[PDB]
Amino acid sequence: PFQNGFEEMIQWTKEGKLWEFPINNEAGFDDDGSEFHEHIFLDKYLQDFPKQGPIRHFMELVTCGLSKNPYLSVKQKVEHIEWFRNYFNEKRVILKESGIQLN
Amino acid sequence: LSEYAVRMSRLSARLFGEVARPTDSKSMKVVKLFSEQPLAKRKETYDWYPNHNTYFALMGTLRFLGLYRDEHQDFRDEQLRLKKLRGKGKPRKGEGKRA
Amino acid sequence: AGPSIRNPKARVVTLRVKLSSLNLDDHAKKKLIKLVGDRYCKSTDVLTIKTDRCPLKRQNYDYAVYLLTVLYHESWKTEEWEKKKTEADMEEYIWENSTSEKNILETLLQ
Amino acid sequence: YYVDWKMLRDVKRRKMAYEYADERLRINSLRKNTILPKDLQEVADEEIASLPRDSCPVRIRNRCVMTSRPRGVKRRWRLSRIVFRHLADHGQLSGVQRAMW
Amino acid sequence: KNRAARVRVSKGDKPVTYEEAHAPHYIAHRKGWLSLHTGNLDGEDHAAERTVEDVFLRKFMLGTFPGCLADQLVLKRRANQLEICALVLRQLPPHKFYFLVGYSETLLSHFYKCPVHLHLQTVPSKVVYKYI
Amino acid sequence: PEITISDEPDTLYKRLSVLVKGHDKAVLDSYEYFAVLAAKELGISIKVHEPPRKIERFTLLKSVHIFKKHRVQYEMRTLYRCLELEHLTGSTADVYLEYIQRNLPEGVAMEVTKTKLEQLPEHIRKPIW
RNA sequence: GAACAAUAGUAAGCACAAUCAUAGCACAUAAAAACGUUAGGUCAAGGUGUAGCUUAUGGGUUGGAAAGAAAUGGGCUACAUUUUCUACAUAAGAAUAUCCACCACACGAAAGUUUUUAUGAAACUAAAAACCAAAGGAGGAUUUAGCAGUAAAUCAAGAA
Ligand SMILES: [Mg+2]
Ligand SMILES: [Mg+2]
Ligand SMILES: [Mg+2]
Ligand SMILES: [Mg+2]
Ligand SMILES: [Mg+2]
Ligand SMILES: [Mg+2]
Ligand SMILES: [Mg+2]
Ligand SMILES: [Mg+2]
Ligand SMILES: [Mg+2]
Ligand SMILES: [Mg+2]
Ligand SMILES: [Mg+2]
Ligand SMILES: [Mg+2]
Ligand SMILES: [Mg+2]
Ligand SMILES: [Mg+2]
Ligand SMILES: [Mg+2]
Ligand SMILES: [Mg+2]
Ligand SMILES: [Mg+2]
Ligand SMILES: [Mg+2]
Ligand SMILES: [Mg+2]
Ligand SMILES: [Mg+2]
Ligand SMILES: [Mg+2]
């Protein structure tokens, strides 16, 4: 049973039902434990790719894009660059036929 | 303009994490393409309609469970009652046309 | 007020640093002006870094102070192309190697 | 029950547009790039063309939430003017008042 | 003639609450607001959801409380919790009233996934501002 | 009331700026009286101003089907109050803003900008690469 | 069913008036505008009374439309010197429908035709260049709108 309105608030807050004060809009979202150099620098996944080719032009724009992006975590960005590796290597015939030898 | 200006700009570019090597205005779109949240993904878009199945079914249940009370459904009901009691109903499927 | 606490505008981190309080060399200070540019206010000597790109504000804070450390460390590195500096690139008019200098020397020659 | 069949098909267009969204973004990443070959772009063309056209963004239509009216919709409240006015006039809409100046 | 949200002149006998006796053009002059939340302010978001919520709360409160609801429902929204204030007539015995109070608070906290608080103030007969 | 002292050097704020947005004037007036009287008791040393109001006006068609010579015009007014605190601590900040925030009215919203004082970062102190 | 040196009228209600809004007044505008009239408008905002459809008057996919011989309402741009260009913001420089064989230009292409580019899965859309420079030379009966920061002219913004 409740002794006071403050008891109400208190119990709602322990229960995690009532909000946390002074409010930080980031309360309850940890973002996977990540830090900026896991977000900003995508070199890690640019390791496997032809280095002097235009594929690095395209993938550097993709990279610089995924860097500027608050809306996605580490995981999905990585899935992007991985789907790109998988698809670029998926077609070996096109890259070579186009007039540039591409790895 | 100078080569000192170009190298300075490349320095700022690769440092800040912006686009380093010079590109077309056209290709730049792809930059802005991954720089944003795509349109069809936004919560202000796919979450546009509240689920109508939810409210509808929930309140109907609560009604038959005798908690919520719908006067609209009662009007409807009573009127189909006085419609069928008259003899003009809603035909059992398949029966009406050909017969 | 509402069910959700998540606010998009929260993430933004700003840094304001007076360049007079930095240990920067003449060369370091002016290469830094030319390097950072628009983030620099020239009258009040205030440098401003706005950081966005990361979801959590801790990350925008660490990457902004990161940008600070990075610009300071690369403001002191003189490289090949900095000896290639155009005289049109100058923030100053240096009396050395000038046109007014050769105009003076020709007028005094005559 | 969604109030119409209209709202039915458009809801399915929201689900779908959320589903193939990644595919869209990544294909249109190459397709809109100049530097890459035209040859990867013809194939990327057949690729986004192959996707069900019910999953594309622009096939989606903004409607009023409750009354389904396709047009005359106020973006911020997702409500048709009839219903908006109705709600605001009873004062059921917060902060909205009649303008005099 | 402007027909928005108005009560027409009868033979002069029609009982009328202060709420329905004032035309929409009076809002913020005399009339207050039925719903209160942050959403329509200059810099803010999700006004739409607080509106859907509002509508459904109207429907819910009028269907859950048959015949006893006195005047239009006052919605407050503060620090994520909703304070639902209802002026209600005296019809049913206190048992069913607390039953439906707990019932509503539980179901509303749980559907909207946020803490709800319900305040009922009982009134002898519908408040009459004009006529009668 | 459990209180604990951690050895770590608590954060300083040069200027804690609090924006209070509203529709109505009265509520913000009263809330101003509240924040002022609350920040006086704790000896926080603050000022308050009124940022000029912003009015949005949009128009809808008056009738269901067709009269385009007839329009209804609806209005949303947002009024401002800004609390400016200077020279406060981190804990004093967390408490004062807790007390100010828990009691915040239903129609009003609050935006706080904190400028926090940091000496210098470590890799910059006085090394040169 | 009223006459104020008043002859049968008294009446709360609701309009108008009064107050609110246009960040002080005053004014103006804004709003307000009862009762009824025009079976005025809308069953395509939505909701329903009455009648109908229920292997279809229902629900989906796919492709298709919106062509002009005209006739007209409303606009925009003009027909040019109070104009046109470029500088530019409010002292400038040049152009200027007839010389004549101009290597056509003065105004006036918003229209066409080419090439781009914006968006988009899809250009039929939109914007910008270049070309082209046509009708038009202040317009018949007859008419619109405005009493002040209005008309007129010039500029930007927002809604979707
Ligand atoms: Mg559309
Ligand atoms: Mg009128
Ligand atoms: Mg006034
Ligand atoms: Mg007046
Ligand atoms: Mg008027
Ligand atoms: Mg009046
Ligand atoms: Mg009147
Ligand atoms: Mg008729
Ligand atoms: Mg209907
Ligand atoms: Mg019906
Ligand atoms: Mg059909
Ligand atoms: Mg079709
Ligand atoms: Mg004609
Ligand atoms: Mg005009
Ligand atoms: Mg004109
Ligand atoms: Mg001149
Ligand atoms: Mg043209
Ligand atoms: Mg010509
Ligand atoms: Mg001619
Ligand atoms: Mg006349
Ligand atoms: Mg005018």
H-only helix segments in B1-99: 3-16, 28-34, 43-46, 52-64, 71-84
**Residues E63-97, buried b or exposed e (16+ Cβ, 10 A)?**
bbbeebbbbbbbbbbbbbbbebebbbbeeeeeeeb
DSSP state of E31: B
- Peptide-bond breaks in chain E following residues (C–N over 2.5 A): none
Q: What angle do CA A67, A73, A79 make, to 5 degrees?
A: 85
The rounded distance, in Å, linking the Cα atoms of E59 and B68 is 10
Residues in chain C with CB shorter than 8 Å from the CB of E79 are 1
How do strand D73-74 and strand D79-80 relate by DSSP bridges? antiparallel
The rounded distance, in Å, linking the Cα atoms of C11 and C63 is 12
Q: What angle do CA B36, A79, A75 make, to 5 degrees?
A: 80
Element (H, E) at F87: strand F71-89
* Gap from CA of A35 to ligand 21 centroid (Å): 59
Coil, helix or strand at residue F1: coil
- Peptide-bond breaks in chain A following residues (C–N over 2.5 A): none
Residue B4 contacts residue C81 (beta carbons within 8 Å):
yes
Residues 6+ apart with CB under 8 A from E3: none
Q: Which residue has the tokens 């903004």?
A: D62
CATH hierarchy code of domain D1-91: 1.10.287.1480
Q: Do chains A and E meet with 3 or more Cβ pairs nearer than 8 Å?
A: yes
**How distant, in Å, are the alpha carbons of B65, C6, E80 from that of B61?**
6, 33, 28
Read off the amino acid at residue C90.
M
Data resolution in angstroms = 3.8
- Backbone φ and ψ of E20, nearest 5°: -85, 0
- Nearest protein residue to G122's C1' (by CA)? D49
The rounded distance, in Å, linking the Cα atoms of E36 and C20 is 50
| Nearest CB to B69; choose among E52, E66, E111 | E66
Q: Do chains C and F meet with 3 or more Cβ pairs nearer than 8 Å?
A: yes
The rounded distance, in Å, linking the Cα atoms of B75 and B77 is 6
Residue of F nearest to C69 (CA): F124
Residue of B nearest to D55 (CA): B40
* Domain ranges for chain F: 1-129
Residues 6+ apart with CB under 8 A from A45: A78, A81, A82
* Domain ranges for chain D: 1-91
Percent helix, percent strand, percent coil in chain D, to nearest 5: 50, 5, 45
Q: Which residue has the tokens 């049973």?
A: A1
Long-range Cβ contact pairs of D80-86 (< 8 A, separation 24 or more): D81/F60, D81/F61, D82/F64, D84/F60, D85/E4, D85/F60, D85/F72, D86/E4, D86/E5
* Gap from CA of A35 to ligand 13 centroid (Å): 72
Chains that touch E (3 or more CB pairs under 8 A): A, B, C, D, F
Residue C98 contacts residue B17 (beta carbons within 8 Å):
no
Chain E residues 12-41 with a CB less than 8 Å from chain D: 24-25, 27-28, 31-37, 39-41
**Residues F88-124, buried b or exposed e (16+ Cβ, 10 A)?**
beeebbeebbebbbeebbbbbbbebebeeeeebeeeb
Coil, helix or strand at residue D50: helix
Residue E84 contacts residue E119 (beta carbons within 8 Å):
yes
Residues 6+ apart with CB under 8 A from E48: D65, D76, D77, D78, D79, E39
Selection from D51, D59, B23, C76 nearest residue A65 by Cα: B23
Residues in chain D with CB shorter than 8 Å from the CB of A83 are 26
Residue E73 contacts residue E58 (beta carbons within 8 Å):
yes
What DSSP string runs through A19-43? PPSS--TTTT--GGG--HHHHS--G
Q: How far is CA A60 from the centre of its chain?
A: 16
What six digits make up the tokens of F116?
A: 């926090």
The rounded distance, in Å, linking the Cα atoms of F106 and A97 is 66
**How distant, in Å, are the alpha carbons of B68, E120, F87 from that of E70?**
17, 11, 52
Radius of gyration from C-alpha coordinates of chain D: 20
